[PDB]
Amino acid sequence: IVGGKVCPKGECPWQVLLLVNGAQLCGGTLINTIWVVSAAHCFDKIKNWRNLIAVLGEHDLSEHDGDEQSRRVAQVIIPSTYVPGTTNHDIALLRLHQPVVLTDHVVPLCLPERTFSERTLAFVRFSLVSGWGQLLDRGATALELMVLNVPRLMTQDCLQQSRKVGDSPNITEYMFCAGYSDGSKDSCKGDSGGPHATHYRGTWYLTGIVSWGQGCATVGHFGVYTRVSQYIEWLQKLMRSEPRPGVLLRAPFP
């Protein structure tokens, strides 16, 4: 996260830390006691699918306290339409081997209904994005969870307000831009998979997933997030699916 603030311990309770063989990999969002939503591109180079751990109640990566809960990732589901190395359909649904226990420090973010998300949440200007990612594009990562308030843009505006770049990825219907183009604030590498959470009439909902951008907080550019509303049905169905043998599962989409 570039230009954000430390999320006071316990105030970003749905934030998930994903580890691969004990090393920091990506972020994620808890939506219930056993399912976590993350980004598909976070698993492009995974080889040891059996060494995937999800940590809840985490805050300071340098100290362990009694609020932290760890669970093995039993399954990783990604849209078969996703193409490693690219940006479209950047979403992953993770099934934990054992459910976490909800506490004052571990709470799931609400996965909203599609229409509610498209007609109402999409028009709340600001939302929170968070993670232990890089504090500057090529800089160091954060030890304490960081959070940032970013304003959302309809894609037409995003395109008209962004500096034209040669081989830049298209902003599809499965994405949306949020942030600032003045080079001051943005999500960044490592934050990938984390939540873009929207507050509406007293409750917080999952509206986006930290996905990509052109260099963190680069002038003339906004951060790009996976448009979760397009995957509500897809996610709900899969969460009712039966456990497969292998870890990785490329499920059909729609």
């Binding site: 309809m154 894609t155 037409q156 505006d157 219907e173």
Partner: protein, 116 residues
């Protein structure tokens, strides 16, 4: 997302047009004339009641009087003018709402003309 178009930015206080005023009355008082401008009602509400242009703009709003061979002008921080006139002579009046601090759209259209 649907196709759409953005409008220009709009700041009400600085851009809404000032309505055409109406001279409420003009009474001769000795060697002077008291010209009163009717309170211009606006769409801004406040407890089942509409605020006047005066209530909204306060000191930013003034009214200008055009009366009369050349013409003379008078200005007021309220909604009333008290001008010196020559007895036996007939005068005509017209008023205009003005927000001097503006650079564009600073004045309303002139009110209907009223003569003695």
């Amino acid at each position: 997302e649907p196709l759409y178009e953005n409008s220009p930015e709009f700041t009400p206080y600085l851009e809404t047009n000032l309505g055409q005023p109406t001279i409420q009355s003009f009474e001769q008082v000795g060697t002077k004339v008291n010209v009163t401008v009717e309170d211009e009602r606006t769409l801004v509400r406040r407890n089942n009641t509409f605020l006047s242009l005066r209530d909204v703009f306060g000191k930013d709003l003034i009214y200008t009087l055009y009366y009369w061979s050349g013409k003379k002008t008078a200005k007021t921080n309220t909604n009333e003018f008290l001008i010196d006139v020559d007895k036996g002579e007939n005068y005509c009046f017209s008023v205009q709402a003005v927000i001097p601090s503006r650079t564009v759209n600073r004045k309303s259209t002139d009110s209907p003309v009223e003569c003695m």
